Amino acid sequence: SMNPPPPETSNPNKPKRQTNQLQYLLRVVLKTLWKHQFAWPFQQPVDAVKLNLPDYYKIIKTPMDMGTIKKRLENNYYWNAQECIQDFNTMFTNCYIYNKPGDDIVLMAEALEKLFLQKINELPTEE
Template sequence: MADQAVRTGLTVITDQIRTQLIKVIDQTKKLRNYGSVFADPVDYISLGLNDYLEVIKRPMDLSTLRSNIMGAEYTYLHQFIKDADLIWSNCRVYNGVQSESFFLKAADECEKAFISLLCRIEQLQLTPEQHRIILQNPIPVISSDDEGPMSILQLHFLSKKLADLPREAQIQCVKWYYKQLGVNEDVDQYKDKDIRLVFKPSDSKVTRELDKLVTRKLDETRQLQKVTKV
């Protein structure tokens, strides 16, 4: 069972599977009485939850999960499943599992519905037991060398994320990229121009690392913007 769960967890998220996962998210959002609770990020500022980010280290919600899957943030099913679980587990951590609050009831009902919908996707052949095993056990890490070239969709979203970065962060990422490739490129020339990168299949390892760097920089930028608004 454990071996099969690992194999299922390592299912590559194809465009067809991505479409089905998006449907699962959208259907969970519509769950009567409870779906709306987790539809969007917790507005901890308006709610006066001043300690929220101290308690919850990695916030997650259905809209963010949807954006991530749309943006090809997940290569494997187990990555998607573990991020989705943060939605329910964060709720339980912040509210306390011993309480009988509406929010814990919402977490239980949404999680149950989400898993049920997920297990109905024929391409996955996922069972509730496999889902539990995937959550409770680390999945072997596949190195960038073994992952192969990024898909056209993944490269598209990498370019979009890079474009969303502040100019200084863009320059830093591009400098890092060319340095890893051993290319002597005058990156400063892009300060007043659009940055255009050409991705080659032979550079897939470096390209995947660039994607991680850009994602991290974008997360840092968004967190800084939230703090600034406060």
């Protein structure tokens, strides 16, 4: 009945850089998702203790959430856009793996995911 430590959002041993793609991921993609009415359950790590889901971190071994992604972007954690995109993908996939197809949280995820894909489609070329 304990949560794991949340994913790191900074690491002095991990190389980082700014790219126009990462800037787009923060200012366009993250910002757009963050303000969506269905965003709030994804704005921080899943609190399996409070939700009384004792099997959550037994099934989900690579947790990820938009709060973590937001901080990673703001804190200049990433080296490239692929790292950040993978984190988004992990967030959605986890939700679909743990929850049932009909569940409210899945329908909320699906709405955010559609939006994410619409924005990621126009990711700028690196320059």
